[PDB]
Amino acid sequence: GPSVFLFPPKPKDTLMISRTPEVTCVVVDVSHEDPEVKFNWYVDGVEVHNAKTKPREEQYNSTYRVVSVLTVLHQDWLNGKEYKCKVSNKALPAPIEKTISKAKGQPREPQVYTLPPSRDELTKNQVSLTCLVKGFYPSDIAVEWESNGQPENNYKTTPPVLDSDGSFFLYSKLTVDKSRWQQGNVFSCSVMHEALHNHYTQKSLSL
Amino acid sequence: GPSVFLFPPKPKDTLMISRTPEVTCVVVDVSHEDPEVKFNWYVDGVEVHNAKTKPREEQYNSTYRVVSVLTVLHQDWLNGKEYKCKVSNKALPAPIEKTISKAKGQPREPQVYTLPPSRDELTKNQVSLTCLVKGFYPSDIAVEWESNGQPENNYKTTPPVLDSDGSFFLYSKLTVDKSRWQQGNVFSCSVMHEALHNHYTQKSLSL
Ligand SMILES: *[C@@H]1O[C@H](CO[C@@H]2O[C@@H](C)[C@@H](O)[C@@H](O)[C@@H]2O)[C@@H](O[C@@H]2O[C@H](CO)[C@@H](O[C@@H]3O[C@H](CO[C@H]4O[C@H](CO)[C@@H](O)[C@H](O)[C@@H]4O[C@@H]4O[C@H](CO)[C@@H](O[C@@H]5O[C@H](CO)[C@H](O)[C@H](O)[C@H]5O)[C@H](O)[C@H]4NC(C)=O)[C@@H](O)[C@H](O[C@H]4O[C@H](CO)[C@@H](O)[C@H](O)[C@@H]4O)[C@@H]3O)[C@H](O)[C@H]2NC(C)=O)[C@H](O)[C@H]1NC(C)=O
Ligand SMILES: *[C@@H]1O[C@H](CO[C@@H]2O[C@@H](C)[C@@H](O)[C@@H](O)[C@@H]2O)[C@@H](O[C@@H]2O[C@H](CO)[C@@H](O[C@@H]3O[C@H](CO[C@H]4O[C@H](CO)[C@@H](O)[C@H](O)[C@@H]4O[C@@H]4O[C@H](CO)[C@@H](O[C@@H]5O[C@H](CO)[C@H](O)[C@H](O)[C@H]5O)[C@H](O)[C@H]4NC(C)=O)[C@@H](O)[C@H](O[C@H]4O[C@H](CO)[C@@H](O)[C@H](O)[C@@H]4O)[C@@H]3O)[C@H](O)[C@H]2NC(C)=O)[C@H](O)[C@H]1NC(C)=O
Ligand SMILES: [Zn+2]
Ligand SMILES: [Zn+2]
Ligand SMILES: [Zn+2]
Ligand SMILES: [Zn+2]
Ligand SMILES: [Zn+2]
Ligand SMILES: [Zn+2]
């Protein structure tokens, strides 16, 4: 019979009040002999009716796939409200329900530290600028780099790593020409996390 | 019918000539009506006969599981030899073969850089000592920390991250009391990777 998958919003969409987070309920392996699908949505057990269901789409394996999208409020998601998607179909002996929420647990604010290149690296043509983000909970987080009101995109960030105290840390590495570093430009590590003030902070790095 | 899984050696066992790396061929879902299992092992297509097969073990789901262990030579594994495990059984329409080798690709030597705590962190009771390992290929690697001929084990290391040039980097974070740092102890980041001389290097960090 059919299977249901319930997907959370994109993490950045939950941390920027200007964006619109949504949860996505996908049903797959709907058959042609029973193609009719009913979604019901609940927020903390209270049925809501503002979801937007897309029309069925036949797949190449002779099944149907159908998606319903529920917009969630910025504050509702961060305050831990629970979103339940119930999918009903004439082939199911009982409806299928799935519930999802923001990662649970007491929040912990990141500490953000920028580290200049190692003295041994200063001999190369490019240098690594390092941003350590530690002590945060939950692990949902975004990191980017900027300089002079422009995105610096030659960077990579590690996944969050579970630290010994139950919080998370990561590192972000930005690679720049040694000349840019020596000329004194200011680089900034930008971090978005639920437990920061306005879910945002910035730390800068320069010679 | 039966399924076969072929496991590589532990990465540290491949990088220390004093250790003994082995590949492990596991067969699961062997039935009771056909419990007889024959392993054949090949190194670069040449059959070898020094593997050590364990006796069948019944599982709680009324199947059998059987394991064969082939020791591999330090140099053979690092030189890219291919290990094939062939499993034969009266229930298979044809034998099952699985092949495994060290991660393939031109090797690249890690650059190892140690970074002292951020100036802003020096106000806390504990500080983070950072070891950046970058530019290495393949991603198999081990990292630990030492001080005064003793293991410093209050550390966490990120997984390898694919960098923009196709090599890998990671970071290791060692947490020590601020007093230990200020008292001038020497901490050392130890790295094992195939492309280092003797697959080993060390970098030290102190105030
Ligand atoms: C018949 O065909 C259908 C349709 O598909 C085939 O699909 C592919 C393979 C084609 O090449 C063709 O062969 C076919 O058309 C099959 O349907 C599939 O069923 C699978 C299970 O049977 C199911 O697997 C589960 O996948 C989950 C992850 O799905 C992600 O990522 C995959 C890529 O890896 C992608 O295919 C999915 O679409 C889905 O993508 C995410 O979707 C969400 C929702 O839209 C996105 O979230 C939104 O994103 C937007 C921006 O994009 C915005 O931020 C919104 O706010 C936000 O809400 C998200 O961004 C997408 N991510 C990406 C990367 O794209 C797994 O989690 C899941 O796992 C759990 O799985 C197992 C349990 O079953 C266990 O291993 C374990 O417990 C795990 O916890 C499954 O792996 C497929 O998703 C599903 N495919 C689709 C397209 O729906 C059907 O199976 C087949 N039937 C038969 C009988 O063969
Ligand atoms: C009937 O029962 C059997 C037996 O087991 C049940 O097992 C558990 C669940 C119990 O609670 C009971 O319920 C039962 O007894 C079932 O057999 C299982 O079949 C699975 C597939 O059907 C198979 O899944 C595959 O697992 C691979 C990973 O296995 C690892 O890790 C798991 C833990 O996650 C562990 O259970 C395994 O033993 C194995 O552990 C590794 O073993 C190797 C070899 O020993 C170790 O390597 C050696 O290590 C030593 C030091 O330890 C030294 O360094 C040596 O030099 C070195 O060689 C390694 O260290 C071990 N690691 C760990 C962490 O322990 C997956 O990779 C694999 O995946 C691919 O899988 C899918 C494809 O099928 C895809 O998703 C994808 O393509 C992936 O690429 C599978 O997930 C189980 O391993 C297997 N269990 C065992 C114990 O063998 C059987 O299924 C069941 N039948 C039925 C019909 O229900
Ligand atoms: Zn309604
Ligand atoms: Zn609940
Ligand atoms: Zn907010
Ligand atoms: Zn033999
Ligand atoms: Zn081959
Ligand atoms: Zn060697």
Helix (H) / strand (E) element for B75: namely: helix B74-78
Q: Are the beta carbons of B131 and B170 closer than 8 angstroms?
A: no
Closest CA to A172 of A110, A130, A118: A130
In terms of domains, do A10 and A45 share one? yes
Task: For chain A, say whether B39 makes contact (Cβ under 8 Å).
Answer: no
Q: Are the beta carbons of A83 and A23 closer than 8 angstroms?
A: yes
CA distance A85 to A62: 24
Strand partners, B5: B26
Q: Are the beta carbons of B19 and B26 closer than 8 angstroms?
A: no
Distance from CA of B150 to the nearest CA of A (A): 20
Q: Are the beta carbons of A158 and B171 closer than 8 angstroms?
A: yes
* Residue B196 phi, psi dihedral angles, 5° rounding: -85, 155
- Ligand 2 site-directed mutation target among B22, B28, B31, B102, most atoms within 8 Å of CB: B28
In terms of domains, do B2 and B71 share one? yes
Q: Is the previous residue joined to B138 through a cis bond, with omega within 30 degrees of 0?
A: yes
Task: For chain A, say whether B201 makes contact (Cβ under 8 Å).
Answer: no
Last residue of a domain, one of B68, B101, B134: B101
Q: What tokens appear for A149 in the block?
A: 């009101």
Nearest CB among A130, A134, A163 relative to B115 is that of A130
In terms of domains, do A3 and A51 share one? yes
- Expressed in Å, this structure's resolution amounts to 2.0
For A119, other C-beta atoms within 10 Å of its C-beta total: 11
Ligand nearest to the CA of A101: 4
In terms of domains, do A119 and A156 share one? yes
Strand partners, B4: B27
Distance from CA of B56 to the nearest CA of A (A): 36
Q: Are the beta carbons of B171 and B132 closer than 8 angstroms?
A: yes
In terms of domains, do A121 and A86 share one? no
Task: Tell me how many domains chain B contains.
Answer: 2
In terms of domains, do A94 and A3 share one? yes
CATH code for the domain in which residue A143 is found: 2.60.40.10
Strands (E), chain A: 3-7, 22-30, 38-43, 46-48, 52-53, 57-58, 64-71, 83-88, 96-100, 111-115, 126-136, 142-147, 151-152, 155-157, 161-162, 168-177, 187-192, 200-205
CA distance A2 to A94: 11
In terms of domains, do A87 and A181 share one? no
Name, in order, each residue with C-beta under 8 angstroms of A113's C-beta and a sequence gap of 6 or more: A131, A132, A133, A134, A203, B117, B118, B120, B121, B128
* Residue A120 phi, psi dihedral angles, 5° rounding: -70, -25
In terms of domains, do B116 and B91 share one? no
In terms of domains, do B45 and B115 share one? no
* Residue A90 phi, psi dihedral angles, 5° rounding: -65, -10
Name, in order, each residue with C-beta under 8 angstroms of A52's C-beta and a sequence gap of 6 or more: A68, A69, A70, A71
Task: For chain B, say whether A57 makes contact (Cβ under 8 Å).
Answer: no
Q: Are the beta carbons of B130 and B118 closer than 8 angstroms?
A: no
Domain span holding position A48: 1-101
In terms of domains, do A79 and A116 share one? no
CA distance readout (Å), A37 to A2, A119, B4, B148? 10, 63, 40, 67
* Residue A145 phi, psi dihedral angles, 5° rounding: -125, 150
In terms of domains, do B202 and B115 share one? yes
What does the H/E/C string look like for A144-179? EEEECCCEECCEEECCCEECCCCCEEEEEEEEEEHH
What is the per-residue burial (b if ≥16 Cβ within 10 Å, else e) of B171-188?
A: bbbbbbeeeebeeebebb
In terms of domains, do A86 and A117 share one? no
Q: Are the beta carbons of B40 and B47 closer than 8 angstroms?
A: yes
CA distance B160 to B133: 9
Last residue of a domain, one of B79, B101, B123: B101
Residue with tokens 């590589």: B8
Q: Which residue of A114, A115, A123 to mutate against B (max B Cβ within 10 Å)?
A: A115
Last residue of a domain, one of A67, A101, A135: A101
Amino acid at A181: W
Q: How far apart are the first and last CA of chain B?
A: 62
